Design a protein around this ligand. Structure first.
Ligand SMILES: [Mg+2]
Ligand SMILES: [Mg+2]
Lengths: 83, 83
């Protein structure tokens, strides 16, 4: 198995900008074959042996977001920086 | 005396963007001749008879800000949206 990855439970929610229903991250990561454990608000995710591409929290975020569907991500223009 | 005015104790701070020391608003408003009573966090301000220009909380805000000095107000860029 690849080494375990520590990641906050709401990290996919923050990066997506969507408040997913609770347990979405844990369910999706378990769906793709990873072992997920809880420690307060921090998950420890061990990817399956056939997923060496999952090495960082960003890799896990893509798994949750693509399975939930990028279409649910709202179009929110960022504020204009003083250019 | 003009009618009394109700105003939050920190309203001058919010409009100025400056955290004034405690009691600044009450001290400045009593300085210019108004009667100030405290009801928790809400100030009741009765301006003196020679100040018929003090009718709204914004008027009291100007009194506090101008006496503390507009030079203490910092320079912060507003959150303009994408145009
Ligand atoms: Mg990936
Ligand atoms: Mg005025």
């Amino acid at each position: 198995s690849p080494p375990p990855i520590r990641m906050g439970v709401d990290v996919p929610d923050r990066i997506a900008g969507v408040a997913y229903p609770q347990g979405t991250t844990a369910r999706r990561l378990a769906q793709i074959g990873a072992v997920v454990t809880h420690d307060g608000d921090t998950l420890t995710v061990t990817p399956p042996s056939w997923r060496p591409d999952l090495r960082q929290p960003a890799d896990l975020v893509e798994e949750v977001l693509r399975l939930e569907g990028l279409e649910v991500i709202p179009s929110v223009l960022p504020p204009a920086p003083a250019g």
